[model samples]
Target chain A: FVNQHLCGSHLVEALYLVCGERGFFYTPKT
Target chain B: FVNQHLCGSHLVEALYLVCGERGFFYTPKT
Candidate 1:
């Protein structure tokens, strides 16, 4: 569902950069 | 802009798993 949403919104590309190209990343309380 | 889009879409959670645990991943042409 989340992926679907991401694709629908066209954000998957940017997510990669935010994650530092690690293919995974966690968001701390912010 | 992409990160913002992703956040708006609320797909960050699932994207993590699809990319493994590396914090980043590339989607091959499919």
Candidate 2:
């Protein structure tokens, strides 16, 4: 099984890496 | 089919929509 993937801060950081600064705050809703 | 992102009050609108409205709150927590 996979030990760890991306989640929480890691996920947010990954999103930023791909999208940039503004993209970080682009969370709309769940 | 994949569902759409539920951006309540519009993603962009969300920022401004709460500006005028009262009793609205946005908290940072997971």
Candidate 3:
């Protein structure tokens, strides 16, 4: 079975962890 | 050139945005 847990082990997790809070479009311009 | 900005436009950011704050490994087991 596929693990559907919320583990920050992937690159996506790391990216959002660092950049998500700033609003999707907001982070890029900065 | 690759965009080195911290934008939540990608899937990674969305994953982390939802999972990263739980201290990496702390999220999956729960």
Candidate 4:
């Protein structure tokens, strides 16, 4: 379960990184 | 202001990614 969760989190981060690198805007509410 | 905020947010995500990659656990309370 933990490994899966970690992997999923990394995937999300990877997407965010790609979007940011490509000039896509991501508005994350705090 | 908006660009600075966005840059800061990205920096935070970058740190989180690094920690997660290094096997550091992060428990975010939803």
Candidate 5:
């Protein structure tokens, strides 16, 4: 299970907005 | 403030199936 995942709520919405565009997700340590 | 939002790990993967997602998850769904 995930320990703790926290970020801006808008980021998820952003993903939803671009869901049709690409396969995307949060990848830390960039 | 968050309530209780819990589904399957696959549902999150299911969200991945949509390249998709929600917010603020806690424990004790029973």
Candidate 6:
């Protein structure tokens, strides 16, 4: 399983969840 | 930094995004 093989624990889930959601807020500074 | 000026928007963003994104996944359980 990719989830298991990726060693995706709750921490990873939380991290990705937070970062994926927030990353758009990081804009290209011109 | 404009980002500093944008800090005033943090509460609005938090309220809007959190409610908008994860809010649907929420269930009011009995």
Which candidate number maximizes TM-score?
A: 2
Cα lDDT tens digits, model 5, A1-29, are 34455445444444444452343454333
* DockQ score of the complex predicted as candidate 1: 0.11
The residue ranges of model 6 lying beyond 4 angstroms of the native Cα positions read: A1-8, A21-30, B1-30
When 4 and 6 are scored with lDDT, the better candidate is 4
TM-score of chain B taken alone, every candidate: 0.29, 0.22, 0.33, 0.40, 0.30, 0.32
- For model 2, name the residue pairs that clash: none
Candidate topping lDDT: 4
Q: Give lDDT: candidate 5, residue A11.
A: 49
Over A1-30, each residue of candidate 3 has an lDDT whose tens digit, in order, gives 344544333544544455555522222212
DockQ of 2: 0.04
- Using DockQ as the measure, which candidate wins? 3
What CA RMSD would candidate 1 show? 13.1
For each prediction in turn, the share of the native Cα contacts (below 8 Å between chains A and B) that it retains comes to 0.14, 0.00, 0.17, 0.00, 0.00, 0.00
Q: List residue ranges in candidate 5 displaced over 4 A.
A: A1-7, A20-22, B1-30
Position A18, candidate 3: lDDT: 57
Question: Which lDDT values do the candidates have, in the order given?
Answer: 0.42, 0.40, 0.40, 0.49, 0.40, 0.36
DockQ (Cα-based) per candidate? Answer: 0.11, 0.04, 0.12, 0.05, 0.04, 0.04
Tens digits of per-residue lDDT, candidate 1, A1-30, equal 234344422454455455543444343233
Runs in model 1 lying further than 4 Å from the true structure: A1-9, A25-30, B1-30
Expressed as tens digits, the lDDT of each residue in B1-30 for candidate 3 is 443444333444444455445422212211
Please compute and give the TM-score of the first chain of candidate 6 against the native first chain.
Answer: 0.38
| Each prediction's TM-score versus the true structure | 0.23, 0.31, 0.23, 0.30, 0.28, 0.23
Tens digit of lDDT per residue, candidate 6, span A1-30?
A: 012222335345333444653542432348
Error of 1 at A4 (Å): 17
